[PDB]
Design a binder for this molecule. Sequence first.
Ligand SMILES: [Ca+2]
Ligand SMILES: [Cl-]
Ligand SMILES: [Cl-]
Lengths: 174, 168, 172
Amino acid sequence: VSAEHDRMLAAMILPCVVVAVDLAAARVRVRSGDWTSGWLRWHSLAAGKVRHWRAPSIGEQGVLLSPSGGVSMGTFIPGLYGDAGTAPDNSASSETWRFDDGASLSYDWAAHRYRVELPSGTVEVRVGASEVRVSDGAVSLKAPKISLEGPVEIAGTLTVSGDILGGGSIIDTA
Amino acid sequence: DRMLAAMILPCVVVAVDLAAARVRVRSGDWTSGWLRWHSLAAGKVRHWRAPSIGEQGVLLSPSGGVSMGTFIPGLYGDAGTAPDNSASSETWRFDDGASLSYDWAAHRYRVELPSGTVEVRVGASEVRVSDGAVSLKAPKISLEGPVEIAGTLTVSGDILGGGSIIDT
Amino acid sequence: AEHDRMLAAMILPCVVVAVDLAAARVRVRSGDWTSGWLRWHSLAAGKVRHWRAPSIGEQGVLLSPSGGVSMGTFIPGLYGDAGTAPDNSASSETWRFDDGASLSYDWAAHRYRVELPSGTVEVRVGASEVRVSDGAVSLKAPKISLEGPVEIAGTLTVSGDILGGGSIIDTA
Ligand SMILES: [Ca+2]
Ligand SMILES: [Cl-]
Ligand SMILES: [Cl-]
């Protein structure tokens, strides 16, 4: 049982790649060499009062950690850049999520900029019955009350279904 | 031998020290001392999210030295189940029902709070979304494009139009 | 006997001492030893990818299969002098940046807060944009729709025509 020592040793920490995802069960199968695992858990960003979900992709690289080389109970740590998921940025001053559809969410502390960028689609901020929606063709604000505090300038036309009440002058140009 | 076994341990969070940023964990019948966990970031940018009681993870201890082991959380279980099952979305879900998610099939970023508030603040400017209101506040508010209001419009100051102003 | 050195080498406490941004690699130090250029575990490397380079002085652990440290991988995120715990709440999830910016959700207060001391927040979808900066909030789109009673605390300037479906009433 001395070869078992180096066996367990070698099996404790394994470089591996995702080959299968059981989404409903939240498990992955990984491959290290010509060995394929059973259904194993991956470490997510949070699994408590807060939970995060981001299933590892097939082809994603990481490391499997198995207590005493008990590989049937190993857990997977993804996030190794590779052909299935390359480094999405190269800046010393940025924290960036990039998605397959070209979307990205990034903070840059050199430029002091938070950027939510979608080539197409919708960004939605909803709290109860209130909503800010940014889409390809519109920005919409919906609420029981819409309050604009400050000088407002409209570069365009304005159409109002209900009454318009002004506390000052109302002056046209035509 | 014993080092071998002690180097990588399956464990569950059993106590949290918020001020010290440490947790105690349990593996089998063994309970650890106060240990650090690996956060998402600990450099120029830092992230904070304390592991919860009952949160499962792994303890890594160099040369079996469990007194200095570090904890990697995030294993789904009773204290925190997988909050989604989609292959095309990335989701934060919170205990109060709030969620922040991006879906790359639908091309949608969604920030959803059942109740409460979302605040985007830059210097003195703010966009605030709450149960009863959306409010914009800034030294200058600029709307570029044709504006349509389904409702009434009340303006405290003057209304100055560059064209005609017509009622019905 | 030779297994001891290997065991010891499999899991190492370490600190970043060099960063190669272009190659996405780090050199770490443990004891008197400095690694070659090694990979770190990012938050995501699949269809979804995340980027956040470990900082010099950031502490973590190196994992090396069979003690082969030349192929070791780095797990960062151990709070230390190069980056301390940025919060202490049991009810928050928080990013805190070096310029004082923060993004945080608090589930006791039911609040999502994006806070920048200065700079810009930009939400861009196609050609539409909501932008918040020190001196302005701007909405830009082929169409801007406000659904609900709108109250303006200030003056209103409109370059184009104004059409009202009810009364238009001034003070003067
Ligand atoms: Ca032996
Ligand atoms: Cl246990
Ligand atoms: Cl790399």
